[PDB]
Structure formats: C-alpha cells, structure tokens
Amino acid sequence: KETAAAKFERQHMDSSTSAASSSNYCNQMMKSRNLTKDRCKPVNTFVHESLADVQAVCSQKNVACKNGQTNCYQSYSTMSITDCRETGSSKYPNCAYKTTQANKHIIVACEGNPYVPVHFDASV
C-alpha cells in the first residue's frame, strides 16, 4: 500500500503550513492522515518543515532511539512542530486531540538507501 518512508511522510510531515492552522488542526490532520481509522492513535507529531530539511536530520546528531537501537538522529536546530495528543474525553470513533504548537529538535529513526527518516522518535 505504501513504503516505510512514505508512511513517515503521511504520519509526520505537513510542509503545507508553517504551523498549526487552528486549535482544531490535530482533529483534522489525525483524521485526514488516516491515523484514527482503527483506533485513536494517542500521540502524534507533525513537522512543518520541508522534506529535504527533515531528511537532512539523518546526517546530524546520532543518538540512541527510545527502543535501544542506535539508528536515531537529532536535529542540530529546532523545527516547527505540532504535538497532537488525544484528550481525556476522546473515545473512538470520535477521536479528539489537543493541538500544541512548538519549536523543538526532532529525533528520527533512519533506514535504507537512500538513508531517510522512517520513524519519529521524539521531540526535545
């Protein structure tokens, strides 16, 4: 259906906006990106930077991933991101999210050739 790289783009990339367009951004994005189809994915981060800039992170700061692996890389500088966290009232099928706009360093897991971001590890 898709590739691991394209899946990262679907779940974590939104280069069309410099930041969350409204407090309802996460409710809209989580749905349109098919992240609430089977269940309400609890947490998710979207990156408001060009693909090239996020892909460049694979050549930046090598750090360990949350799972112990060491194919993770942290951005040298901060990026415009939107943290989407499911609200306490949220209940599938009616997924509801709190939209939080921030500027933080991102940590992504890189794989393949071309070595590109495939998993979003965290924002710091």
| Positions at the binding site for substrate | 7, 10, 41-45, 66, 85
**Catalytic site includes residue 105:** no
Which residues are documented as binding site?
A: 7, 10, 41-45, 66, 85
DSSP state of 11: H
Q: Is the dihedral of CA 97, 99, 105, 109 positive or negative?
A: positive
Q: Which of 8, 9, 12, 99 is catalytic?
A: 12
DSSP state of 39: S
**Catalytic site includes residue 12:** yes
Q: Which of 30, 105, 119, 121 is catalytic?
A: 119
Q: Which residues contact 63 (CB under 8 A, 6 or more apart)?
A: 70, 72, 73, 74, 107
How many Å apart are CA 36 and CA 30, to the nearest integer? 6
Q: Which residues are catalytic?
A: 12, 119
